[PDB]
Amino acid sequence: TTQEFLSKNKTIESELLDLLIKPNTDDSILTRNKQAIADRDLFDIEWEPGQSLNKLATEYLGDSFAWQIIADANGIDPTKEIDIGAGLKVPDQKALENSIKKFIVNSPTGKQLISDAKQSILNLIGVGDSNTEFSKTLKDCIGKVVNFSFD
């Protein structure tokens, strides 16, 4: 019944169930901004009186809600003050599409081309849900009746 075991040094049954802590960077709040737009694709403007991120988004990106990209391109907390004469980097409209990195992912179903970028650009590109296919939209609404718990 009992099995006397003494101390050892290196065993493979322990390697089988060994390493646990895994430092993988997966989709989370602290990995949304991993991807960076190339420096050659930006414009280096100067902060002047009367400027705001809304204006910069409107003139350069054509959309008022695009400011999230600009701040994400600069590491700027918007509610913080931008000093007068401080430099900012504004993304181009036509040069924002080349920050979309396409790679092939392997699946038991098959190869899939996948877009990768900072999440702000992903939201801006998919605005209006134009890029996604209608089948995806129908898939997420298939389960309309949602199980709720009662107390």
């Binding site: 709040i29 809600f65 999230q68 999440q119 702000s120 939201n123 998919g126 605005v127 209006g128 849900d129």
Partner: peptide
């Protein structure tokens, strides 16, 4: 955390 589409 952010809303995907604000005009939406």
């Amino acid at each position: 955390l952010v809303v995907d589409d604000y005009e939406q």
